[PDB]
Design an enzyme around this catalytic site. Structure first.
Site, PDB file in Angstrom:
ATOM      1  N   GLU C   3       6.204  19.062  -5.784  1.00 46.00           N
ATOM      2  CA  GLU C   3       5.725  19.006  -7.752  1.00 46.00           C
ATOM      3  C   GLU C   3       5.499  17.820  -8.357  1.00 46.00           C
ATOM      4  O   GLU C   3       5.698  17.835  -9.339  1.00 46.00           O
ATOM      5  CB  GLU C   3       6.090  20.177  -8.209  1.00 46.00           C
ATOM      6  CG  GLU C   3       5.999  21.469  -7.681  1.00 46.00           C
ATOM      7  CD  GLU C   3       4.911  22.398  -8.264  1.00 46.00           C
ATOM      8  OE1 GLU C   3       4.268  22.374  -8.687  1.00 46.00           O
ATOM      9  OE2 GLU C   3       4.396  23.228  -7.719  1.00 46.00           O
ATOM     10  N   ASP C   4       4.423  16.840  -7.832  1.00 43.06           N
ATOM     11  CA  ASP C   4       3.928  15.411  -8.176  1.00 43.06           C
ATOM     12  C   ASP C   4       4.805  14.832  -8.521  1.00 43.06           C
ATOM     13  O   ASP C   4       5.277  14.378  -9.155  1.00 43.06           O
ATOM     14  CB  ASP C   4       3.048  15.892  -9.221  1.00 43.06           C
ATOM     15  CG  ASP C   4       2.114  16.503  -8.908  1.00 43.06           C
ATOM     16  OD1 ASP C   4       0.968  16.260  -8.426  1.00 43.06           O
ATOM     17  OD2 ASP C   4       1.495  16.932  -9.152  1.00 43.06           O
ATOM     18  N   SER C   5       5.747  14.858  -8.474  1.00 42.94           N
ATOM     19  CA  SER C   5       7.663  14.128  -8.469  1.00 42.94           C
ATOM     20  C   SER C   5       7.584  13.520  -7.045  1.00 42.94           C
ATOM     21  O   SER C   5       6.598  13.530  -5.895  1.00 42.94           O
ATOM     22  CB  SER C   5       8.767  14.657  -8.680  1.00 42.94           C
ATOM     23  OG  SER C   5       9.274  16.070  -7.318  1.00 42.94           O
TER      24      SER C   5
END
Ligand SMILES: [Zn+2]
Ligand SMILES: [Zn+2]
Ligand SMILES: [Zn+2]
Lengths: 42, 45, 49, 56, 49, 308, 69
Positions: C3-5
């Site tokens: 999730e976009d990490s």
């Protein structure tokens, strides 16, 4: 008649400074903004 | 008194609370305070 | 990294990867309130301030 | 409503003055004193009211 | 051990943005109240809610 | 003469008076420093207007202006009604004087404090019996002159007279009257320092040199010459303007700047005869009127000064 | 600002090869690829450390010192 009092230099100076220091143009908004210096591209 | 440094001619001055803020040699009106002479510790990380 | 990490390398950080400076400037003036009240730069003492 | 809302009371004859909490006085550096906008409006009402009384 | 899959591996250009957690993390249990509404003040820098 | 209505926060348990009180601003608490008992909680840290307590006292007013939608007919009548106020008329006179003081100070390129002091000086010394038969022009000029002296930017009588048309008679008498008013109110309810001294010729030299366009080195030398210029009795009684200008002229020839005595007198409106007359006396004390470091270094030599 | 001391990925010391890298490019008329291989930087993690470095310290040195002894 005193020419030093007939012409007040503050009218031109104050008006230009106020219009440039703040966004208000006159006497539209946001015309002048603080230049971004975070990075060269900005 | 405390020691200040001129920002243009790099003159090292000494000013008191009564002396005006200006370089007595060149007349510049901005003075940079001298760096502390006391040791400061740093971590090499 | 879901999730976009992302996952970064601690060793690279230790060596100086994506490590930056930060400067903050503080402004202050000795305002003179008319002809009587004025301010000064001083190290105040608890017995007088 | 006879007890609470009568038509005659829609015309203001006596103006209640809100207490200071409604119009607090703020301070920026504490050497300068600022007043709420309501305080000036209340001051304007008093000045106009006194002027009308003297004129009449 | 080898990963059963092969990884797309190579250099790439990355840039650090202005947003850092240290400048956004804040908490309040109690603190100053607004003069007018007597509610928690607004702003992390002012210990707001 | 009135109700106390004063609250003192003391620790009920410690009972020590006066108490040690620490204000936890972040926690919004007032806590005893000895035991930690909290004495007051829920501490408090545009919906207002900028008000100046001194120059305006206690005067609250609002203006009437157009909005997003408005008929011109209503605005005109309301402004007309507002102007015809008997109580606000008295304060308008002080405000009108402040407006003219602002115009004079602004036209003089003076700092904000100088304008503030002039306005405050007028307010303090206005509405007094002594100053009733004096022209308002002299009153404003005297306050402006007073304001400049307070802010270490003292000007000259001739400089202020260039803007405000007032003769020396009324201006000097008004200033002396105005000074007494401030001094009387000062101790009774500071005002002056070594700056208030009339001569203060050191302050004029930097501005006079700027008009002549001389380098700061010449200006610094002139300051030293003027400072030691007061040790000679033959010229100590001269006016500060002449003392400063003559000292500037002496250094101009010392550093050999191609500026003649006519230019110095013309720009500062000092008679040429006075410049040469004063220079003659100062020519006899060159040793005591020249910086020692400059002569020792060799930048300026006494032989370069023309002799008569 | 100045050449990093170590390679970020593997930690190999690359801060002692900046002057050598510049000398190879200027005097020896070598291309960037050959100069890096000559200096012994085989992994492309080390190559990019010296290849993509920007020497901003020289630009700063143009300004006069704030405090002179
Ligand atoms: Zn300097
Ligand atoms: Zn206690
Ligand atoms: Zn490497």
């Amino acid at each position: 008649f005193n020419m030093k009092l007939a012409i007040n230099a503050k009218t031109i100076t104050s008006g230009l400074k106020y219009a440039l220091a703040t966004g208000n143009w006159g006497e539209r908004a946001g015309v002048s903004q603080v230049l971004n210096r975070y990075t060269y591209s900005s | 008194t405390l020691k200040y440094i001129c920002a243009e001619c790099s003159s090292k001055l000494s000013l008191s609370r009564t002396d005006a803020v200006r370089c007595k040699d060149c007349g510049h009106r901005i003075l940079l305070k001298a760096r502390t002479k006391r040791l400061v510790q740093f971590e090499a990380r | 990294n879901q999730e976009d990490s992302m996952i970064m390398n601690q060793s690279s950080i230790d060596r100086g990867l994506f490590r930056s400076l930060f400067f903050r400037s503080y402004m202050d003036q000795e305002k003179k309130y008319g002809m009587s009240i004025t301010e000064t730069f001083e190290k105040p003492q608890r017995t007088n301030t | 409503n006879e007890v609470f809302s009568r038509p005659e009371w829609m015309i203001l004859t006596c103006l209640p003055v809100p207490p200071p909490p409604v119009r607090p006085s703020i301070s920026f550096n504490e050497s300068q004193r600022g007043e709420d906008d309501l305080t000036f409006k209340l001051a304007d009402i008093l000045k106009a009211n006194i002027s009308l009384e003297t004129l009449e | 051990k080898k990963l059963m899959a092969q990884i797309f591996f190579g250099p790439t250009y990355y840039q650090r943005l202005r947003h850092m957690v240290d400048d956004k993390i804040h908490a309040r249990a109690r603190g100053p109240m607004q003069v007018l509404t007597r509610q928690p003040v607004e702003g992390r820098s002012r210990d707001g809610g | 003469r009135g109700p106390n209505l004063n609250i003192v926060l003391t620790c009920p348990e410690c009972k020590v008076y006066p108490p040690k009180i620490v204000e936890r601003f972040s926690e919004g608490d007032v806590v005893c420093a000895l035991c930690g008992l909290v004495l007051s909680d829920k501490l408090v840290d545009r919906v207002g207007e900028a008000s100046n307590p001194l120059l305006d006292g206690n005067n609250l007013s609002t203006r009437i202006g157009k909005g997003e939608t408005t008929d011109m007919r209503f605005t005109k009548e309301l402004n007309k009604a507002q102007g015809k106020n008997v109580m606000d008329k008295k304060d308008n006179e002080v405000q009108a004087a402040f407006a003219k003081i602002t115009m004079l100070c602004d036209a003089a390129e003076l700092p904000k404090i100088v304008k503030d002091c002039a306005k405050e000086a007028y307010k303090l010394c206005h509405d007094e019996k002594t100053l009733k038969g004096k022209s308002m022009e002299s009153i404003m000029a005297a306050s402006i002159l007073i304001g400049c002296r307070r802010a270490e930017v003292a000007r000259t009588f001739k400089e202020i007279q260039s803007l405000i048309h007032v003769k020396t008679k009324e201006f000097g008498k008004t200033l002396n009257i105005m000074k007494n008013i401030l001094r009387g109110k000062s101790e009774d309810g500071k005002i002056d320092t070594d700056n208030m001294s009339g001569a203060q010729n050191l302050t004029y030299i930097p501005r006079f040199c700027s008009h002549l366009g001389l380098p700061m080195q010449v200006t610094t030398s002139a300051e030293y010459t003027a400072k030691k210029c007061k040790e000679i009795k033959e010229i100590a009684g001269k006016s500060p303007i002449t003392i400063a200008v003559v000292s500037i002229y002496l250094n101009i020839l010392l550093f050999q700047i191609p500026i003649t005595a006519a230019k110095v007198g013309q720009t500062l409106q000092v008679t040429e005869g006075t410049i040469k007359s004063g220079y003659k006396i100062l020519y006899e004390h060159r040793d005591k009127l020249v910086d020692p470091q400059l002569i020792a270094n060799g930048v300026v030599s006494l032989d370069n000064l023309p002799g008569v | 600002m100045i050449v990093p001391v170590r390679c970020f990925s593997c930690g190999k010391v690359v801060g002692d090869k900046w002057e050598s890298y510049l000398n190879l490019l200027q005097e020896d008329e070598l291309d960037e690829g050959t100069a890096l291989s000559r200096l012994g930087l085989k992994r492309y993690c080390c190559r990019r450390m010296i290849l993509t470095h920007v020497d901003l310290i020289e630009k700063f040195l143009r300004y006069n010192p704030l405090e002179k002894r």
